[PDB]
Amino acid sequence: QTQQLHAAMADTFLEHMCRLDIDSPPITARNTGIICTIGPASRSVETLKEMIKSGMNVARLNFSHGTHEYHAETIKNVRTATESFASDPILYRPVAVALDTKGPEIRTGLIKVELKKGATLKITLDNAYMEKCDENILWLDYKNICKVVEVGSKIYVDDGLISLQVKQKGADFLVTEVENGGSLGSKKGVNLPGAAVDLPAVSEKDIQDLKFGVEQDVDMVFASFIRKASDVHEVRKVLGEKGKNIKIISKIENHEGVRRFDEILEASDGIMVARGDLGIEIPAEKVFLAQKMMIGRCNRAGKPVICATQMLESMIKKPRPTRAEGSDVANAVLDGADCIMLSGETAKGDYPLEAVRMQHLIAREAEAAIYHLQLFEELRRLAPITSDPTEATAVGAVEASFKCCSGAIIVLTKSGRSAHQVARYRPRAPIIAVTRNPQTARQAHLYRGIFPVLCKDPVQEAWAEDVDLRVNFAMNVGKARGFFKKGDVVIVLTGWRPGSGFTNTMRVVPVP
Amino acid sequence: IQTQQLHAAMADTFLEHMCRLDIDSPPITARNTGIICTIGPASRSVETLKEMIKSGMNVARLNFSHGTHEYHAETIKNVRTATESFASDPILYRPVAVALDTKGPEIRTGLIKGEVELKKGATLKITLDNAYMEKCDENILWLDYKNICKVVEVGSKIYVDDGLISLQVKQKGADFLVTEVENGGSLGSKKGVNLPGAAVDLPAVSEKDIQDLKFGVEQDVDMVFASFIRKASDVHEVRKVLGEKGKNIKIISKIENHEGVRRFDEILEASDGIMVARGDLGIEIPAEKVFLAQKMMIGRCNRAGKPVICATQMLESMIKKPRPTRAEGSDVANAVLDGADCIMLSGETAKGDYPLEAVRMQHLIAREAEAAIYHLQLFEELRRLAPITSDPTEATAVGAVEASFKCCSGAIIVLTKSGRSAHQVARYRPRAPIIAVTRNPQTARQAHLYRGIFPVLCKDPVQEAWAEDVDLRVNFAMNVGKARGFFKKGDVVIVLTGWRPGSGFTNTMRVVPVP
Amino acid sequence: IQTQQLHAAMADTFLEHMCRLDIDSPPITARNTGIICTIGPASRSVETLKEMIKSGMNVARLNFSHGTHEYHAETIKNVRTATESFASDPILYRPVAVALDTKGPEIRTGLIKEVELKKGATLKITLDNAYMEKCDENILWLDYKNICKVVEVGSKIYVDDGLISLQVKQKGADFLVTEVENGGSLGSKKGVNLPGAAVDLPAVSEKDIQDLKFGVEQDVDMVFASFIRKASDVHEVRKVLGEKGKNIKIISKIENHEGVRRFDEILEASDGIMVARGDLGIEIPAEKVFLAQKMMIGRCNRAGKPVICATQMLESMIKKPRPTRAEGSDVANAVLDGADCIMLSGETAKGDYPLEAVRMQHLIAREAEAAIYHLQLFEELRRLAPITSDPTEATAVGAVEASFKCCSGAIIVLTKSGRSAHQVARYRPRAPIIAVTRNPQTARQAHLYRGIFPVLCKDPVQEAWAEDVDLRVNFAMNVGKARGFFKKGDVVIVLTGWRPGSGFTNTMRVVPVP
Ligand SMILES: O=P(O)(O)OC[C@H]1O[C@](O)(COP(=O)(O)O)[C@@H](O)[C@@H]1O
Ligand SMILES: O=P(O)(O)OC[C@H]1O[C@](O)(COP(=O)(O)O)[C@@H](O)[C@@H]1O
Ligand SMILES: O=P(O)(O)OC[C@H]1O[C@](O)(COP(=O)(O)O)[C@@H](O)[C@@H]1O
Ligand SMILES: O=C([O-])C(=O)[O-]
Ligand SMILES: O=C([O-])C(=O)[O-]
Ligand SMILES: O=C([O-])C(=O)[O-]
Ligand SMILES: [K+]
Ligand SMILES: [K+]
Ligand SMILES: [Mg+2]
Ligand SMILES: [Mg+2]
Ligand SMILES: [Mg+2]
């Protein structure tokens, strides 16, 4: 029994669970993409190389902190570490760069502090106190707060750990009662659930950052606090035609984003289940519901989805994660998430590498436990009857791959989409996407199962032989990575002519 | 609005699928189930034999329990004359197989003394005395089976003429038997006799059977329907007689008795296909049990990828009437819904008053039945029970069929020499017709045994560049498709080829628009 | 090893289920599908009519397109004489329903001057009543006096079970000139069918009203209403049956294109449906019948209402003691489709082998019932069942579920109107439903539903209602033992109510047999 072969042959979901075996080793290929946030603990080229070794697929820059040149330097360090392996196209791994926006977030000022259950707290908009915060007065970013808050509303501060109830309202001040204490630091996040904030989804600073990313030639944008389709369209407009290829991933962080989800998903390249803010904005017991709902609909719609925030919190201070954290990652993968994300764990943690290694390990185990019979089956029934060659070839390829127990599905692609279409049907076997486009190579990490492979060889002449060469390139990468051996059987997808959108050929071929 | 039960096939449950079946939903012009017609007095003329091909006959059956070698030699000639009369156009031409159905170990009566009527109660004597072999009446009756008195019993039931006459043995003699008529009816000349629950010792392949098989090999037949097969060793005997000169001739075992049903897995395994011979079976085992046997055998053949023919009395009524009974229409439909590769007419086309109308009716019902097939559940269950194999051809076939459901394709075009590339696509039961393009005339004719395979014979000379030779055969299929109304210009199609010439290199699937 | 296809029903897939079907696995002695026999010259005698009950006839059909009112009045008397001849023993006694099948809006020819028709030779059709008994190869008379208004130059006219076909060449005022398209010999008073032509004959005619009112008086159990085409036609039958016969079940017969199309409309207004294949097979194309049949049986199963598969199930046996392979196959499939009842017409009305025909239906239905994939069936019937807060329904589903679990020999159900039993039936248990009632009419009507064994209690109403219940439960218990449905040690499901009167069933008990 390899990678839960006996588990996947079961008739029922329950019999499948019962047959799950801890002593059944997974395949060396790991399908779920890993996204790491880069900060003080992971910024050095030296450790940044080791994160790629450990399995980081995408690098996140959080734009709610740091200056433009702080990030410009981070990107440089990432590309230095990444291209340090470029001297060997076979073992080399593309690494994407992601810009996560600040967005319409509310922050406190600087502390001059411990708060007590009962003791009152005044909230001012007076900029004279913006660096003089204590147990009596507190300053905020949101200068229009007094228009949307209420006598009796709950205000949450610092990851929703401090809660306050508004007793009295003023013109530019609010009198609150501390409902649960804890200590208050500098520049902390503020939430207002059940209160319709009027801050724009794309602000002035947001426009600056997006235009900056376009120039830094980023791969994707994680747009914070998206609440409707019109907000997604605004991000597109700002990115413009110069960055029209940059992927837009909408972050669902609030009640409205959950509710107008179908509206949003439709207008976006992908979705991130931003659990941090979401866990404050809606009740904490409801998050798993939202998470599973969104991952399912993304799976149904073939668009990428990232499970994010607090997946391994413990590891910010500890070398081993809690049982619940290990359980959380596994389930996120079993839910069908394309990518999983580390934040604090890799930005400011004491154990950034161990945290990444742990994500690889769990995702690989979780991928084996996937009931591929029922999954692929249900994904067919819900797939549309289409007369598009590419789609038909993709379904057929995945189907063939389950039948001949193949080691990989090799796919030649320019824009990435040929590979995207194979991925949405979730084969067991890894999809090796061979492209010459460096950007689509990096972007391919958003999709579950896609192993992007960048070809550096010059364009041969006879297009037939040029194809063959790229196919053999994939073949060598496969052998070297231990995805398959010599005698093994493999699926190869090509097109009848050059250019995007002509994939129509599936071949079953033994390995050289 | 809603073609070939598209709304019916999209249902979640088998019951919801039945409820959504709509009489006003027209089927596709392609009909997948093969039709096999028995040729006799009513269908022997080249002239009417042409019209049977027009109507949809795919295979011609010669029943070798009647007629002389040269009677059949002439029938075959007439068949090939009618078939090649369309050969002047490779696009509209249809290959037609020839089948030899053996006499086998059957028991017959003698001739009625110069129609005798039998009465419930009146006794009847059965003699082996060859002096009475042409002097049969209500008192004496002669038989073929000279070893009958060794396997029959005082109290055994003997059935005569399609099991319509029944007799109980009262006394046993050395060469005679005294019986009591249990239900009457009139007795004719040379009628079939059945002995259920009595182990007959007649050989499966007799001397006459060997003569007929060797004759078929020489007449270059396509398939053998072997009567009264009871075990694997009987199948192996047919192989041996057919020899190396006729090693390509398909062996279809006919299940006609209790033992054949029981050692079925043993038999199917050793045979190229199976025929559910309902006529004799319905006498040999209880009539209420036939449907069980039928459904069991069709399912196991579907599981095993081997062809299966539902046979005998599918449209009896039409021997004398232009319209079939409601039960007969229902029977054909169910046979197809059960998953039968071919359906067969016997008396209906051999000696009937309406041979053509009988064939037209089979086409019509089979086409309607094929639309009503719950393809979601069928294909699905055929995957789960398909073996995990590292054979390129098989993987390409499954993927092709899968792709065809996805892009709603009009056909799956398959280049094949031996037929097997096409066989492997057929066992997964696509909606779309499989157009099998071959140069081998024999595999073209044999391809009719498999559900969904449209054999197409290429007469063009071998082009040079093998690449272009392939392209030409692919375009040949394309033209046949357009002309037959299987697909139009803009339509999407699946094409299966190999990486090099020779059998067993199919590994390439292409999704291609039609010229 | 393996009783009534136990190994076949344990399969994971429909295909694996087919493969595991075994001819050497004997069925249970209980047979669930109801048998309906048409009574005529061959089966009219009290003496043979007793033997039909012995063989398994559950309902008796009277075809009202032939015979006079007193012909039928006599037939009914003979049926009730044969039936009550077993009444001297309540345990072995079997209730037998009486059914009135209407004539309806049918078209007939006149009397022959038999005459032979030839492909090509022309034929004139007259409405002139002077020729109504002078029919030959040149002239032919008809019932439908408004025919010339709905037929066309080029229309096809079918005569005698759709075996003769004619094409209209010229149209007149009261005549039609046709060309014979396929011959055959023409007899007296034969059925005529006009497909694709909208006939304006009323669904319930004057004669139909007379027959319905006659049935009400003869205290019939059900009405098979011919040529129903819309819900308004069903409502007309109700009105005529009135309040004096409001308990008489209305089974609509689907015989034409319009009836198929407005089926949901019809089924919804009717107590049940009959797939009248004879006329339907002429009215719509013969290749399309199986589709219609399977569609209608499925929808009736979904809707919990009875459905009868009818006409030409065993034609061969009108003249032969053994049926054709196709006929044996047809019956089986009709049962496998989920039909509540199967019907013999010519086979028992005018056949040479009425008894052998009934015995054959028993035998096939019993084999077919064993082959039923009960896992998938019951399962799909739950998913499509409505979430209801009705006690009776909940108790029925739970009972059937319990019966699959404890491999029970029966489900015993006390019922007055029959409905408690109807609700258990629609979920299709393996085990036979023994419905114990005192109402003689609901006992006879219970035969319309698959699986229901109606049992009539003749004992006087005991006093303590608790003991009165117990007695009826023990009555069922004795009937079960005597019929060989179960033994002493066996386990059984019992359904009762908390108080007397209809619609209080809410109690399910699992009980060993005395
Ligand atoms: O970007 P897409 O839509 O995946 O297109 C993939 C294309 O790549 C090919 O494999 C060849 O690519 P090139 O044109 O770059 O040589 C085509 O056959 C196919 O149409
Ligand atoms: O059904 P078969 O006998 O395996 O035929 C499949 C063969 O057809 C082909 O497409 C053409 O074969 P030939 O060139 O020998 O005619 C081969 O590539 C492939 O091996
Ligand atoms: O099917 P119905 O007409 O609702 O009959 C069920 C009724 O029969 C009983 O089992 C017996 O009551 P009766 O004595 O009135 O017949 C009741 O408990 C129950 O309400
Ligand atoms: O921004 C995030 O990652 C969040 O809110 O979880
Ligand atoms: O062999 C046959 O076809 C039969 O017995 O019916
Ligand atoms: O009347 C009928 O029963 C029919 O037409 O089938
Ligand atoms: K024969
Ligand atoms: K009638
Ligand atoms: Mg956030
Ligand atoms: Mg035979
Ligand atoms: Mg009728």
Side-chain angles (χ1 to χ4, degrees), chain C residues 270-317:
Chain C
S270 328
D271 295 321
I273 291 295
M274 186 200 291
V275 183
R277 290 140 102 238
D279 277 289
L280 191 70
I282 313 305
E283 221 73 30
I284 62 153
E287 339 87 275
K288 289 180 171 302
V289 184
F290 76 94
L291 288 167
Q293 185 189 300
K294 288 165 185 299
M295 178 272 286
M296 288 184 277
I297 292 179
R299 293 198 197 171
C300 289
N301 286 1
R302 212 225 271 113
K305 285 175 181 175
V307 66
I308 306 154
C309 186
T311 305
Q312 292 184 6
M313 302 214 76
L314 303 173
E315 275 294 285
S316 193
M317 292 183 85

Side-chain angles (χ1 to χ4, degrees), chain B residues 14 18-19 21 23-24 262 278-279 289 295 300 313 325-327 330-331 334 364 368 377 381, chain C residues 14 19 23-24 257 261 277-278 287-288 294-295 299 312 324-325 329-330 333 367 376 380:
Chain B
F14 189 89
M18 277 195 278
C19 295
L21 286 173
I23 68 152
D24 292 320
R262 230 203 305 272
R278 290 139 102 240
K289 291 182 172 301
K295 289 166 187 298
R300 294 196 198 169
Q313 292 183 7
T325 64
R326 302 307 163 275
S330 167
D331 176 50
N334 289 301
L364 283 174
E368 291 288 341
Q377 191 181 213
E381 293 184 338
Chain C
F14 188 89
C19 295
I23 69 151
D24 292 320
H257 205 125
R261 229 201 307 269
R277 290 140 102 238
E287 339 87 275
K288 289 180 171 302
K294 288 165 185 299
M295 178 272 286
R299 293 198 197 171
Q312 292 184 6
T324 64
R325 301 307 162 276
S329 168
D330 178 53
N333 289 298
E367 292 287 343
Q376 191 180 213
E380 292 184 338

Side-chain angles (χ1 to χ4, degrees), chain C residues 163-175:
Chain C
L163 295 171
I164 319 290
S165 75
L166 321 167
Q167 188 174 52
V168 176
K169 302 281 102 168
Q170 290 153 34
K171 190 194 286 184
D174 81 302
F175 61 87

